Design an enzyme around this catalytic site. Structure first.
Site, PDB file in Angstrom:
ATOM      1  N   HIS B  41       3.013   5.303   5.132  1.00  0.00           N
ATOM      2  CA  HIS B  41       1.612   5.579   4.719  1.00  0.00           C
ATOM      3  C   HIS B  41       0.635   4.694   5.507  1.00  0.00           C
ATOM      4  O   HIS B  41      -0.578   4.894   5.358  1.00  0.00           O
ATOM      5  CB  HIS B  41       1.460   5.556   3.202  1.00  0.00           C
ATOM      6  CG  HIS B  41       1.372   4.198   2.602  1.00  0.00           C
ATOM      7  ND1 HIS B  41       2.232   3.788   1.608  1.00  0.00           N
ATOM      8  CD2 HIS B  41       0.490   3.196   2.784  1.00  0.00           C
ATOM      9  CE1 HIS B  41       1.890   2.574   1.209  1.00  0.00           C
ATOM     10  NE2 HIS B  41       0.857   2.177   1.920  1.00  0.00           N
ATOM     11  N   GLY B 143      -3.423  -4.160   0.671  1.00  0.00           N
ATOM     12  CA  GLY B 143      -2.988  -4.823   1.912  1.00  0.00           C
ATOM     13  C   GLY B 143      -1.577  -5.375   1.789  1.00  0.00           C
ATOM     14  O   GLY B 143      -1.044  -5.823   2.824  1.00  0.00           O
ATOM     15  N   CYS B 145       1.204  -3.778   1.027  1.00  0.00           N
ATOM     16  CA  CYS B 145       2.270  -2.824   1.371  1.00  0.00           C
ATOM     17  C   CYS B 145       3.053  -3.351   2.583  1.00  0.00           C
ATOM     18  O   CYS B 145       2.478  -3.988   3.470  1.00  0.00           O
ATOM     19  CB  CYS B 145       1.700  -1.426   1.570  1.00  0.00           C
ATOM     20  SG  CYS B 145       1.000  -0.752   0.043  1.00  0.00           S
TER      21      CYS B 145
END
EC number: 3.4.19.12
Lengths: 304, 304
Positions: B41, B143, B145
């Site tokens: 993603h 942020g 991830c």
């Protein structure tokens, strides 16, 4: 979202841990520049720990009696001195992994990360607070002495604790990196009882702010209070008195949530008086006091 | 003595964290050998997250659209592929700090350390469990991830989690390092409700053994039970069923304490039925289930 008991990343400190052996005693040392810092009781047998005279025991020790191993490589000791309750072993090699660092003496209520070590090797990292009675509630076994407590401000490691002692009650005592014990404790195997382990009120309030930010709001009530009224209740529950300095420190969390500090005090007052009634706050059934206001802001804002 | 929620020392993993940017999305990557692993993603706008077609979005991306920064030095991307829900960015430089490592897919109830990162920079380390509903209860902001979960066996880092998603309930979902989500979760901003967050019974029992070892014994009762009788009570309290495999795993703690597993089950049964009555166990007012039997042995024996 979510709120965890979070330690500083340990890598910068892992790079500083060494093994110190004197005769048959092995513990941990901290290697910063060309100095290895370790508990002076490295020079003691367990017999010596009953009534040690450190100056007299130290006379019988030479540089070559201090065996310092970094990984599986021996460091050459070219000097040694006692500063309060720590030894400073001068070695011939600056630690190439020395981070930017400071030695700080923390106040009760301040939190820090502990890198638990055995034989100079890191086993685990966890978060602690300097208790109001100047103990810490650590996780430390035989060989853990010289494990250190620290905070990190970006790239600067502030060392605040070195582990020396377990009290008969299984709570912990140690020094700053100048070798001065926190509280009245001594590096002697004797009767040392801890005082009242009071609750760090400003830290509980910070953690209630963390709860609101993270969606746990059931305990927010319709009341307010005053510092004096709150403090009558704090006293009764063995909570530290809340000062205007604490109110000022909670200002940013007050601002972020729109909940006045004294309103959160009144919520905490009702929790003390009524209990949790089987409910939880941020996955805890008791009021957590090992998050500082700075910890809550850091974790809620994602500082690196 | 003492028992803490302890994470693995994070240094070996800190050495692997990088920043990955694709267009305006920045998150974290894991750099092992000459491959950077990150959530797919990274290629999505927040608009795309509503209903992304990853294969179609990926067609519009070239190697040079993936900006990989390790410290303040850019890595050259020479290849990219999608494996399940992760991207593998081939870079022209092997990570010189690559530790010995494995990719493992953990089972519910297994614990691991999370190194929370933002912009490729570590902010904190904490201990998690794979919940029985295949969520984890993390601490993760925008942020975060590509932050990873891991265990360490001496010098081998076993990577078991990469952070992808926060559910509307503020619990967390992610993948193993092959990009396969834990549980039924998807990398899409949609309705994803978690199932029952049951209590990890074998972990509670381990932690009660930790309590006995560390001097907390008030809950030890005069009773025993059977797996079937205990399990009737477990079911009622949303505890996982205890199997003979769990009993076998608790054997070493049984041996160390001399308390038969089924006797500890009967102590746990009474705690479930009676509650704590305002008492604590290892400083907790609820029964802790994010210590595995292996964690308790490790922490109680001081493995490095």
């Amino acid at each position: 979202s979510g709120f965890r008991k979070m330690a500083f990343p340990s890598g910068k400190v892992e790079g500083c841990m060494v093994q110190v052996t004197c005769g048959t005693t092995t513990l941990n040392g901290l290697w910063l520049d060309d100095v290895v810092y370790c508990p002076r009781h490295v020079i003691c047998t367990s017999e010596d720990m009953l009534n040690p005279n450190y100056e007299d025991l130290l006379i019988r020790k030479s540089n070559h009696n201090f065996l310092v191993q970094a990984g599986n490589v021996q460091l050459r000791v070219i000097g040694h001195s006692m500063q309060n309750c720590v030894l400073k072993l001068k070695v011939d090699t600056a630690n190439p992994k020395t981070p930017k660092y400071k030695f700080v003496r923390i106040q009760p209520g301040q939190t820090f990360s502990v890198l638990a070590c055995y034989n100079g090797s890191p086993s685990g990292v966890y978060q602690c607070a300097m208790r109001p009675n100047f103990t810490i509630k650590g996780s430390f076994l035989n060989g853990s002495c010289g494990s250190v407590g620290f905070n990190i401000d970006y790239d600067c490691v502030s060392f605040c604790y070195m582990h020396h002692m377990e009290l008969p009650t299984g709570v912990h005592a140690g020094t700053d990196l100048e070798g001065n014990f926190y509280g009245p404790f001594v590096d002697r195997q004797t009767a040392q009882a801890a005082g009242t382990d009071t609750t760090i009120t400003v830290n509980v309030l910070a953690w209630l702010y963390a709860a609101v930010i993270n969606g746990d709001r059931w305990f927010l009530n319709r009341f307010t209070t005053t510092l004096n009224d709150f403090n009558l209740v704090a006293m009764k529950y063995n909570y530290e008195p809340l000062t205007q300095d604490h109110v000022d420190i909670l200002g940013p969390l007050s601002a972020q949530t729109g909940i006045a500090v004294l309103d959160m005090c009144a919520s905490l007052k009702e929790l003390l008086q009524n209990g949790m009634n089987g409910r939880t706050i941020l996955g805890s059934a008791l009021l957590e006091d090992e998050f500082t206001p700075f910890d809550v802001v850091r974790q809620c804002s994602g500082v690196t």
